[PDB]
Amino acid sequence: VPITYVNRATXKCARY
Amino acid sequence: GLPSDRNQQISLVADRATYNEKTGLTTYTGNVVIEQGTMKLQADSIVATLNSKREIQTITAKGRPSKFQQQISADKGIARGEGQTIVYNADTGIITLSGGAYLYQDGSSIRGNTLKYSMNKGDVEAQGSSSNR
Domains of chain B: 5-116 (2.60.450.10)
**B120 close contact with A: CB closer than 8 A:** no
**One-letter amino acid identity for B32?**
V
Considering only the beta carbons, identify the residue of A5, A9, A15 that sits closest to B15. Answer: A9
d(CA B118, CA B83): 15
Q: Assess A2–B contact: CB distance below 8 Å, yes or no.
A: yes
Residues of chain B contacting residue A12, judged by C-beta atoms under 8 Å apart = none
First to last CA, chain A: 12
User: How many CA atoms, within 13 angstroms, populate the side-chain half-sphere of residue B28?
Assistant: 24
Which of B8, B15, B17 faces A2 most closely, judged by CB atoms?
B8
Q: Give the Cβ contact number of residue A3 at 10 Å.
A: 17
| B23 contact partners, CB below 8 Å, separation of at least 6 | none
Q: Could you tell me if B49 and B75 are in contact, meaning their C-beta atoms sit under 8 angstroms apart?
A: no
**Over the range B67-83, which residues count as b (16 or more CB within 10 Å of their CB) and which as e?**
bbebeeeeeeeebbbbb
Bridge partners (DSSP) of residue B19 are B26
B101 has which bridge partners? B83, B112
Question: What's the longest Cα–Cα distance across chain B?
Answer: 50
Q: What's the CA gap between B112 and B127, in Å, rounded?
A: 5
Q: Do B13 and A8 touch (CB under 8 A)?
A: yes
- CA B70, distance to chain mean position in Å, is 10
Residues 6+ apart with CB under 8 A from B61: B41, B43, B45, B46, B47, B68, B85, B86, B87, B88
